[PDB]
């Protein structure tokens with residue numbers, strides 16, 4: 001399965017599944033600084049799933065590893081901003097992270113395998 005370009009549509013489909021998850025609602029658009037006035041005191045690099053989808057559709061990811069780094073930043077931002085491990089929005093992030101990691105692992109493996117096959121000779 002050595003298609004070097006296959007990751008892009010695989011990531012589009014996984015983003016569609018994440019947008020159908022009720023657990024993604026807080027992560028679909030940038031944090032409102034009006035409602036969370038201290039957000040940018042703590043978070044130096046905002047990230048949301050609409051920004052990830054737009055970056056992918058612009059052709060501004062070279063690899064699924066770059067997309068994976070931005071999605072993991074959504075989750076690390078939620079962990080850094082939460083006042084408690086028992087917060088609603090943080091708990092939604094942990095379930096969504098487990099779902100994302102379960103589905104991205106084959107996308108990364110197949111891409112890296114395809115690149116190794118491309119350089120085989």
Ligand SMILES: CCCCNC(=O)N1CCN(C(=O)c2ccc(C)o2)CC1
Pocket residue numbers: 025026027029030031032035036077078079081082083087089090
């Ligand atoms: C305007 C449409 C939604 C915008 N998102 C949004 O407001 N947030 C999601 C990110 N965030 C957190 O990760 C987080 C962790 C713990 C708590 C209370 O928030 C801050 C809130």
